[PDB]
Design a protein around this ligand. Structure first.
Ligand code: HEM
Ligand SMILES: O=C(N[C@@H](Cc1c[nH]c2ccccc12)C(=O)Nc1ccncc1)c1ccc(-c2cccc(F)c2)cc1F
Length: 450
């Protein structure tokens, strides 16, 4: 049971961080075919990171349980945002109970009015910033706004949106996000040091909890006198009760709510943006025409069944945008026990990684991996890990693709788009969640005449 092959280090303390930083895909691709191995070890500032770049071996990463392959350590830099003691910072069963409640709230059973709520909100956007016959806009920005507005409309009741609208909420979320130092996965010390930024999320957190409390107290004042039939993500979570029979504290409720919105914000937008960029490119008229054929029968007011059931192709477009260019590049676990990966053994201490970026460009799994083709299929079973797998698979997946499909459907009905460059935009590897390079997403909308 040998250690996997490790790439020679040529920079004493830093290791491979510089090179891995400049060009992720390339670096890993070279490491792979340099060492003729899908499984291999690199070195981040002293730390050993074993990457599992062989899709046939994805199950050895996604199936071991928390006690052998743990997310706490590596995702503890998210504490300021979810809360101390919430999600990854909680006892694993408590962590698990928590995520289950969240999942219960985002299942397809709860999707009844989401689609009309999403359209109303999309149309509202389109009719205020896309209100000319032709226009230049930044599509990434604009899908981001659309995504957050639709999330809020699906997930929050009117009374909360009166106090906290999507605009306000994006700002509180940005404050929160500005204190994140993902660097601290490899330099833990940073999680314990106060920084210029540290205070910023706490201020937005306390403002957010303050609002939720006041909302709940008023909700109580009207249940004194009514059915108050409508429920939302908030009332959902407040009726949750742990196995031990105690309910969630406000701190935890709020943690789940931001964790929800935060998680979906960039990933769903980026996925929308990419899909449209691909669909509007000359080279992909074939696919744009196909999508539009799928939409052709549909009514103005879309419904649960149109987008849940009658849009296979729109889904393939979203999933393939993710496949070509996944928003999350490196997924990670801390190795609690020696564990067996293919012909190798990964020792206790290692950070173990599985990278959707790498696996989605395995030429066997995905012939011509830089070609965006919505009709392809994985040539290896399980090579698509865009939404993770096994114990920590994405729980927002369905809600996410609901937003994207409804947005594509609503957009491409009323409009055409004109990419303002020759080629589709390049990914930008220099942000924690990756998307098309923002400065390259300026785009022209054209209102359709029919
Ligand atoms: C296109 C949209 C999305 C993509 C590409 C995406 C991607 C992923 C991936 C790759 C994972 C696995 C993480 C890992 O294995 O370490 C994951 C997990 C997760 N995602 Fe998403 N996600 C999306 C949307 C959402 C949304 C809308 C939510 C919630 C509102 C959400 C909540 C989560 C949660 C809670 C997990 C936790 C898995 C766990 O630890 O049990 N995601 N997502
Ligand atoms: O790492 C980041 N975000 C993770 C968080 C995450 C990891 N495990 C998760 C499990 C559930 C939910 C969220 C996460 C994420 O979005 N993960 C996720 C997981 C599952 N589904 C969807 C999404 C992140 C890091 C830095 C920044 C940033 C941006 C601007 C300025 C700045 F200073 C920093 C933004 C980010 F967003």
């Amino acid at each position: 049971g040998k250690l996997p092959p490790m790439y020679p280090v040529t920079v004493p303390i830093l290791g491979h961080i510089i090179q891995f930083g400049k060009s992720p895909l390339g670096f890993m691709q070279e490491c792979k075919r340099q060492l003729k191995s899908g499984i291999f070890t690199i070195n981040i500032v002293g730390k050993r990171v074993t990457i599992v770049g062989d899709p046939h071996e994805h199950s050895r990463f996604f199936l071991p349980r928390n006690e052998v392959l743990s997310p706490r350590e590596v995702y503890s830099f998210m504490v300021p945002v979810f809360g101390e003691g919430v999600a990854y910072a909680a006892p694993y069963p408590r962590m698990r109970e928590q995520l289950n409640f969240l999942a219960e709230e985002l299942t397809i059973a709860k999707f009844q009015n989401f689609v009309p709520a999403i359209q109303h909100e999309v149309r509202k956007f389109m009719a205020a910033n896309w209100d000319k016959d032709e226009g230049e806009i930044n599509l990434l920005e604009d899908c981001s706004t659309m995504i957050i507005n639709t999330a809020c409309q699906c997930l929050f009741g009117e009374d909360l949106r009166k106090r906290l609208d999507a605009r306000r909420f994006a700002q509180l979320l940005a404050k929160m996000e500005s204190s994140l130092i993902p660097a601290a996965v490899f330099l833990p010390i940073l999680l314990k040091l106060p920084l210029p930024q540290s205070a910023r999320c706490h201020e937005a957190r306390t403002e957010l909890q303050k609002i939720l409390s006041e909302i709940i107290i008023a909700r109580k004042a009207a249940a004194v006198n009514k059915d108050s039939s409508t429920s939302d993500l908030l009332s959902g979570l407040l009726s949750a009760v742990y196995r031990d029979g105690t309910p969630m504290s406000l701190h935890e409720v709020c943690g789940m709510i931001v964790a929800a919105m935060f998680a979906g914000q960039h990933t769903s937008s980026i996925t929308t943006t990419w899909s449209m960029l691909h669909l509007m490119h000359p080279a992909n008229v074939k696919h744009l025409e196909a999508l539009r054929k799928e939409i052709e029968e549909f009514p103005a007011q879309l419904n649960y069944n149109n987008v849940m059931d009658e849009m296979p192709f729109a889904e393939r477009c979203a999933r393939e945008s993710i496949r070509r260019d996944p928003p999350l590049l490196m997924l990670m676990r801390k190795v609690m026990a020696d564990v067996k990966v293919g012909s190798y053994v990964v020792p206790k201490g290692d950070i173990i990684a599985c990278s959707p970026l790498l696996s989605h460009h395995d030429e066997e799994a995905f012939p011509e991996p830089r070609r965006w083709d919505p009709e392809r299929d994985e040539k290896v079973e399980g090579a698509f890990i865009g939404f993770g797998a096994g114990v920590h698979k994405c729980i927002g997946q369905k809600f996410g693709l609901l937003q994207v499909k409804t947005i594509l459907a609503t957009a491409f009905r009323s409009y055409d788009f004109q990419l303002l460059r020759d080629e589709v935009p390049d990914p930008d590897y220099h942000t924690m969640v990756v998307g098309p390079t923002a400065s390259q997403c300026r785009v022209k909308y054209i209102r359709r005449k029919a």
